[PDB]
RNA sequence: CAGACACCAUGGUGCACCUGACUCCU
RNA sequence: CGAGACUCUGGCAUGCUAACUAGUUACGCGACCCCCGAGCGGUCGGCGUCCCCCAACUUCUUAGAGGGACAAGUGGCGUUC
């Protein structure tokens, strides 16, 4: 533990983080590296603790939703622990590294603003940040998760590891490819 | 022969209570009784929940007024009728100051 | 007889006291160990100090716990931030400035504030809204 | 306390007495320049003191209305006889005594003196016995269905966050006419806030006194003497 | 040592099958209809809950000085569901908590003592610490 | 200790006192009349003293009138 | 960018300078000290404001 | 003259390090009074990593330490401190032997004897308090003792005899006897407040230095003026070797150290770097002390940092 | 300075009022 | 004048003052005593209970005085204000 320490029932050790603009906002091994994802329970006192936060510790965060879900974490990183092995029993790999590449996969490259011209819609090719490229990353994933729950026979663990492993892949299949797609559509598109 | 007298003070002027229970330890050894100290016990924070408006059409204002009372107890080993003697006298207002004989 | 320090662990209302008393013992919270009451979700969290430290800096003592207040998250903190400082409070005055700098130098690059008190409680509710921020819902024409 | 009314109730019972004893000697004492009451727990007496600014209506002759004053105090409040002792109070200023001026102006404006010229005697005369600031505030219905408002302010007038609640001192009176109701509403912000002695809340939250240093100098060599 | 020191919901659960190796456990003549509490929408799916209960009341007293009928109800209940209005913790029935209460003490795993109500046996204390090591040397949680 | 009294009658203040409600010495007392001039019959000062041999007449000599006035000597 | 010094931190410790600018220094605990020694200031806080504010000067007037 | 090379740092403070003090047994030992609320007790390793190794943490004030003053044998921390108490702390341990209560202000100063039993204690409550070992204050000299803040008292050692010889912030410096308490003299004629005052190691010279910095010698048997030594620069801290006349300034910009017999300078201790802003630039030696051997010259700054200096022509 | 520019109508009532003096007799 | 200043509160005071309507740790720690475990067993350590004291302390806790927050600091920037 003191050599390196490793995620709850995974390691944070061997987790490739590859993409190119998404560098130490997604960590888990680099100084995140953690067991327990909490920090204090706040995560909105700075716009720096958000690259603090990790992105494993923001899907707990980012989850807890919907109001008879909102102030329950203890039900959540339950459920996250539990999505982790329904994404190995799928994979083999290293679950939190199927999360990381679910970022990967589900971080837009070019979006759109809007723009006025002469009473037509036209939007502006604009990169997003890769702060907001990691952010519409989980929140596209925390969105198919409980949704394909809600009527199901699947717990939000079983439609999130698929949400992580269609977006660590992209199969479009995990509401995050797919919904990123059309984001980044607008920026070729008009004007 | 001693007898410990509870001396409880109740106020709601803090420095009103802070100077009378500073005479009652100090005159406790002046002429010489138990000296104890202030057994600083919790204050009680009277809330009552009112409306600002009456009739009240508009906008829903409350206003709550507190009250705080402040009370502390004195134990003192010593004799009885001098412990209340010196301590009662001498103290008429601002603050209630109870010598009691229980305890005992 | 034996030699102890006493110290606290602070959330929004839970202050937890442990007093690292010399002898052999173990770190018991309440008289017990951690694998206890069961909240047991956020376990990993008051079990990642002693793993980083060493159990021989806290079985080189006796740490009987007295906690109170808050939730079951408040005192896991509570806890945490307690036996953080009891192994600091324990090795300063009695044994070295050494050890428990280098319990300080572990504790404190994960930085979990297990040292340092929270100012963090409940914001002071005000009326006209039910929520300490948040307002009722408003009708216009 | 066992087997009274509660502490919490105990002073809450306090002001109780107090508010329906200034409410009624409002009522009857407001011919003696009504400025309050000061009842002192004695042991044996109940010392009410009577603040006012024409104490010569509180005995009667050789102490009539008092065995009649007290009488109501004693008899229907609760108290022994020879508790409720009676005491004046003529207090020595009345110009700072805003709670008998507004009792006193409305002796010159209900009993009749002019407008401006009664707001010019006694708000000079309030400042003539010393204020920080004092103002008048007579508003309501005046010359037939409208209602007006008569600002006479004199002095510094201060409304800034806490030190508006300790500096000042205010009277309203709710004067009768003919017509209607006006409210003599009186303010006199206290000359006595930095002194006398000192006054309320540590010298104005505004300023700041230092003392002058006369140290640090000198033309002398360096040569010490055996003490 | 304690009951505290080792695992509650293994202690629930073994010392409800003491309490079957005690073979009885003093049941009322009401558990296969009744509503047993408020709070709960459904009557229960079996009477093996009482040994249970029980084993959690025993477990109970033995931490306290002593308690009785009222402080068993607040321990299993909790959100009595209030249907179309907000739900709110109360206490459930006050007969078979105490049908509880007469039976530990009638078997002498509990029994009347100081601190107004039930404390421990001390046949108690040792068939709670005897437990305690089956619950232990089995499996720590 | 001051007498405070709202009228003071005709032996009003200032040597009219210093031999009247008490024999013992007094610092000084304000009044609102100018003592020598107008001989004015006016009451609406006060009466300071020392309070070592003056409690004893002014108590049996207040509510009275020397001249039409009402001496309130209530002690303070 | 809040609670920038008013009128009245200034104004206050100008006369501190000219006056006491051998025993004021760079330090605040001995300025606050000093100013608790030299000055009547209402409150510890505005105290702290000042003291400081002459800590700020002093190391302005020593330039 | 001789002359000193940087034979080290000191390390491991958070606040200024506002006294310094070695005992007379362990020249090893060096009690460094920072602004962290708590004394850190320094067993020197002179090594070339630091200097010491921290020792004690003697927890606990509400306020700074300002000045410290250690046993003659190395066992006893008094800790003078701005929470107006000084505490007598088992320096081995912790261990307050002693919270000293009564100084109403920011205790300024303290001195402990080579009787090892006079406690004496200057303060901003302009007050001289001889305490006992126990806390009792033996008595309480005032009455023209300092009517400005006390600044530094300091001992005579009081094998030669029993003298306060204390400086203050009324640009004095009241050097009494004690158990009379009574000035073997007052030192009149000083420039600027005397934040320092400092003895011969026989209690034979009285130097004293200040505000303007200028120390100036008095033959402190007599109390009478020797010279005035030429700093010029707010001295914070001055002290003779106990092995030779070196008295040495803890000055604004620099160290200035000298030869007092005879009075020539040998070295300028820096302390300064380029870091211009320029009103934020310049640190300052807020404390310098001798070894026990008077070999090392210990300078505790406001820099977090006790550099030292063993005599290296 | 040095990239892209659409239509959008209506609507109503009372009080701003013309002089000085200070024997409160303290 | 408002605002600021100011009040009160959240924080920070193992400093400091007090405790038998608070307690705490502390003993001898026993006792209900459990061997549960070590220890053969005592003892240890043990949730409570209590022996608890003429222990101790205010740490928890209460409430009292205080101090702490002032770019104050540093280092850039800014009329360098």
């Known amino acids: 533990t003191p050599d390196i320490k490793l995620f709850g029932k995974w390691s944070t050790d061997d987790v490739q983080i590859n993409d190119i603009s998404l560098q130490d906002y997604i960590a888990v091994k680099e100084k995140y590296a953690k067991y327990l994802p909490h920090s204090a329970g706040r995560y909105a006192a700075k716009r720096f603790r958000k690259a603090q936060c990790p992105i494993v510790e923001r899907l707990t965060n980012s989850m807890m939703m919907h109001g008879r879900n909102n102030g329950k974490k203890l039900m959540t990183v339950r459920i996250v622990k539990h999505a982790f092995e329904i994404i190995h029993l799928l994979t083999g790999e290293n679950p939190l590294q199927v999360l990381v590449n679910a970022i990967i996969n589900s971080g837009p490259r070019e979006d759109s603003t809007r723009i006025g011209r002469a009473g037509t819609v036209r939007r502006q090719a604009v990169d997003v940040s890769p702060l907001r490229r990691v952010n519409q990353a989980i929140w596209l994933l925390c969105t198919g998760a409980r949704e394909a729950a809600f009527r199901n026979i699947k717990t939000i663990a079983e439609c999130l590891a698929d949400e992580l492993i269609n977006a660590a892949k992209g199969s479009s299949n995990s509401y995050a490819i797919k919904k990123k797609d059309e984001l980044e559509r607008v920026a070729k598109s008009n004007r | ?104 | 007889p034996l030699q102890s320090v006493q110290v606290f662990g602070r959330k929004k209302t839970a202050t937890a006291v442990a007093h690292c008393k010399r002898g052999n013992g173990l770190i018991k919270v309440n008289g017990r160990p951690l694998e206890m009451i069961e909240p047991r979700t956020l376990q990993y969290k008051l079990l990642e100090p002693v793993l980083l430290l060493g159990k021989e800096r806290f079985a080189g003592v006796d740490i009987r716990v007295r906690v109170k207040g808050g939730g079951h998250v408040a005192q896991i903190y509570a806890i945490r931030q307690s036996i953080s400082k009891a192994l600091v409070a324990y090795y300063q005055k009695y044994v070295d400035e050494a050890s428990k700098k280098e319990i300080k130098d572990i504790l404190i690059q994960y930085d979990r504030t297990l040292l340092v008190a929270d100012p963090r409680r409940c914001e002071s509710k005000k009326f006209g809204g039910p929520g300490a921020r948040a307002r009722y819902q408003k009708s216009y024409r | 306390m066992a087997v009274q009314i509660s502490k919490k109730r105990k002073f809450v019972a306090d002001g109780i007495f107090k508010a329906e004893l200034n409410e009624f000697l409002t009522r009857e004492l407001a011919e003696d320049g009504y400025s309050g009451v000061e009842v002192r727990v004695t042991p044996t007496r109940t010392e009410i003191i009577i603040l006012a600014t024409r104490t010569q209506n509180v005995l009667g002759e050789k102490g009539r209305r008092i065995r009649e004053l007290t009488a109501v105090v004693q008899k229907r409040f609760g108290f022994p006889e020879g508790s409720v002792e009676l005491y004046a109070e003529k207090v020595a200023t009345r110009g700072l005594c805003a709670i008998a001026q507004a009792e006193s102006l409305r002796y010159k404006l209900l009993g009749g003196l002019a407008v401006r010229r009664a707001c010019y005697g006694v708000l000079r005369f309030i400042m003539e016995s010393g204020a920080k600031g004092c103002e008048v505030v007579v508003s309501g219905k005046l010359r037939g269905q409208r209602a007006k408002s008569m600002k006479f302010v004199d002095g510094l007038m201060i409304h800034s966050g806490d030190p508006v609640n300790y500096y000042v001192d205010t009277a309203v009176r709710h004067v009768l006419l003919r017509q209607g109701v006006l409210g003599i509403k009186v303010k006199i912000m206290l000359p006595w806030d930095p002194s006398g002695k000192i006054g309320p809340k540590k010298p104005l939250p505004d300023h700041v006194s230092i003392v002058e240093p006369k140290d640090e100098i000198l033309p002398t060599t360096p040569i010490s003497e055996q003490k | 040592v304690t009951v505290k020191d080792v695992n509650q919901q293994e202690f629930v659960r073994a010392l409800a099958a003491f309490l079957k190796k005690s073979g009885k456990l003093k049941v009322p003549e009401w558990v296969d209809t009744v509503k047993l509490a408020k709070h709960k929408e459904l009557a229960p799916y079996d009477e093996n809950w009482f040994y249970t209960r029980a084993a959690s009341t025993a477990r109970h007293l033995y931490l306290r000085g002593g308690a009785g009928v009222g402080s068993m109800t607040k321990i299993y209940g909790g959100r009595q569901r209030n249907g179309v209005m907000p739900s709110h913790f109360s206490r459930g029935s006050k007969s078979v908590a105490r049908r509880v209460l007469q039976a530990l003490e009638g078997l002498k795993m509990v029994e009347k003592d100081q601190d107004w109500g039930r404390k421990l046996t001390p046949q108690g204390q040792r068939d709670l610490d005897r437990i305690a090591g089956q619950v232990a040397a089995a499996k720590k949680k | 200790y001051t007498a405070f009294l709202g009228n003071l009658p005709y032996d009003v203040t200032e040597e009219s006192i210093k031999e009247f409600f008490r024999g013992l010495n007094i610092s000084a007392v304000r009044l609102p009349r100018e003592p020598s001039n107008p001989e004015r019959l006016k009451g609406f000062g006060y009466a300071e003293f020392e309070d070592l041999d003056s409690l004893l007449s002014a108590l049996s000599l207040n509510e009275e009138s020397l001249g039409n006035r009402r001496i309130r000597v209530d002690v303070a | 960018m809040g609670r920038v010094r008013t009128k009245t931190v200034k104004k206050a410790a100008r006369v501190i300078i000219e006056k006491y600018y051998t025993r004021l220094g760079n330090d605040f605990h001995t300025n606050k000290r000093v100013c608790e020694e030299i000055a009547i200031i209402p409150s510890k806080k505005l105290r702290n404001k000042i003291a400081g504010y002459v800590t700020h000067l002093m190391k302005r007037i020593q330039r | 003259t001789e002359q000193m090379t940087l034979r080290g740092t000191l390390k491991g403070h958070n606040g200024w390090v506002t006294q310094i003090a070695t005992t007379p047994q362990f020249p090893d030992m060096i009690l460094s009074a920072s602004r962290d609320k708590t004394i850190i007790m320094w067993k020197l390793t002179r090594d070339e990593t630091n200097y010491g190794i921290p020792q004690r943490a003697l927890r606990g004030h509400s306020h700074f330490v300002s000045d410290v003053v250690i046993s003659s044998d190395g066992q006893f921390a008094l800790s003078g401190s701005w929470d107006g108490t000084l505490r007598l702390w088992d320096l081995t341990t912790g261990t307050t032997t002693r919270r000293f209560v009564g100084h109403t202000k920011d205790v300024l100063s303290v001195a402990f004897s080579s009787d090892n039993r006079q406690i004496v204690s200057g303060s901003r409550d302009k007050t001289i308090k001889l305490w006992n070992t126990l806390g009792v204050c033996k008595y309480t000299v005032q009455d023209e003792s300092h009517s400005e803040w006390v600044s530094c008292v300091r001992f005579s050692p009081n094998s030669s005899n029993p003298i306060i010889v204390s400086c203050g912030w009324d640009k004095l410096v009241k050097v009494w006897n004690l158990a009379n308490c009574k000035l073997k003299t007052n030192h009149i004629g000083h420039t600027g407040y005397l934040n320092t005052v400092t003895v011969s190691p026989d209690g034979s010279l009285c130097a004293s230095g200040g505000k303007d910095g200028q120390a100036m010698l008095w033959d402190l048997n007599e109390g009478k003026h020797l010279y005035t030594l030429d700093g010029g620069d707010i001295i914070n801290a001055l002290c003779f070797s106990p092995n030779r006349y070196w008295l040495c300034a803890a000055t604004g910009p620099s160290i200035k150290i000298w030869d007092l017999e005879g009075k020539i300078i040998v070295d300028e201790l820096k302390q300064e770097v380029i870091s211009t802003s320029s009103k934020a630039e310049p640190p300052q030696c807020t404390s310098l002390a001798w070894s026990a051997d008077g070999q090392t010259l210990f300078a505790g700054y406001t820099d977090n940092l006790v550099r030292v200096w063993q005599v290296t022509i």
């Not at chain 2, 919790?42 to 906008?59: A, M």
């Open chain 2, 1 to 104: 022969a001693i007898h410990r007298i509870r001396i409880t003070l109740t106020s709601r002027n803090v420095k009103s209570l802070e100077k009378v229970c500073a005479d009652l330890i100090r005159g406790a050894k002046e002429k010489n009784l138990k000296v104890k100290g202030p057994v600083r016990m919790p204050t009680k924070t009277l809330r009552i929940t009112t409306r600002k408006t009456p009739c009240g059409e508009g906008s829903k204002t409350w206003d709550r007024f507190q009250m705080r009372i402040h009370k502390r107890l004195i134990d003192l080993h010593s004799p009885s009728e001098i412990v209340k003697q010196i301590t009662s006298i001498s103290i008429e207002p601002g603050v209630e100051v109870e010598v009691t004989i229980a305890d005992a």
